[PDB]
DNA sequence: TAGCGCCCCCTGCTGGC
DNA sequence: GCCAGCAGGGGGCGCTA
């Protein structure tokens, strides 16, 4: 811990990476700045893959299918749908994922205690899902 | 420094069951 | 409906040409 931060425990090997840390989290100075909206980072790169969501380049093209990507890691997300990678499991019944959202999720829907439930407004049906509520309007009812 | 890399976060849909 | 699969837009770190 050569650079000590002098707001918190935390400390660096480089002075470079404590004034990113010091900006990320202590100071907010976000100097690079995109210019078709209001979004700004303390990395050019988070600019740049910003970028890429206005312009819809996909610079990172899946080699087994038509998929392409804005950001390298969501290609190596997107390559678990053809590879059947499971990488994330739940410490409680060990059921295994293809996200780490999807086993936050599961460990939400099936070893906690009291999680608040949506509710259908229509029909009187308690779900369990946001996503799953709005599946249930569409097909169901109307919408 | 900008540029890779990591991984996480969160969000919201599909379609088999 | 439950469920896991699956994609989009982001943050924060560790490292370094
Ligand atoms: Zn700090
Ligand atoms: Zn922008
Ligand atoms: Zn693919
Ligand atoms: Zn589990
Ligand atoms: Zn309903």
Request: glycine share 4%; with cysteine.
């Amino acid at each position: 811990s050569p650079h000590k931060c002098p707001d918190c425990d935390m400390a660096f090997v480089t002075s470079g990476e404590l004034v990113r840390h010091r900006r990320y989290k202590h100071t907010h100075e976000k100097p690079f700045k995109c210019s078709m909206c209001d979004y700004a980072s303390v990395e050019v790169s988070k600019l740049k893959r910003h970028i890429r969501s206005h312009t819809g380049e996909r610079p990172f093209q899946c080699s087994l299918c038509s998929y392409a990507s804005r950001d390298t890691y969501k290609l190596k997300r997107h390559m678990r749908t053809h590879s059947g990678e499971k990488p994330y499991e739940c410490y409680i019944c060990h059921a295994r994922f293809t996200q780490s959202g999807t086993m936050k999720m599961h460990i939400l829907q099936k070893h906690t205690e009291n999680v608040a439930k949506f509710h259908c407004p229509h029909c009187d049906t308690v779900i369990a899902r946001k996503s799953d509520l709005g599946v249930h309007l569409r097909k169901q009812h109307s919408y």
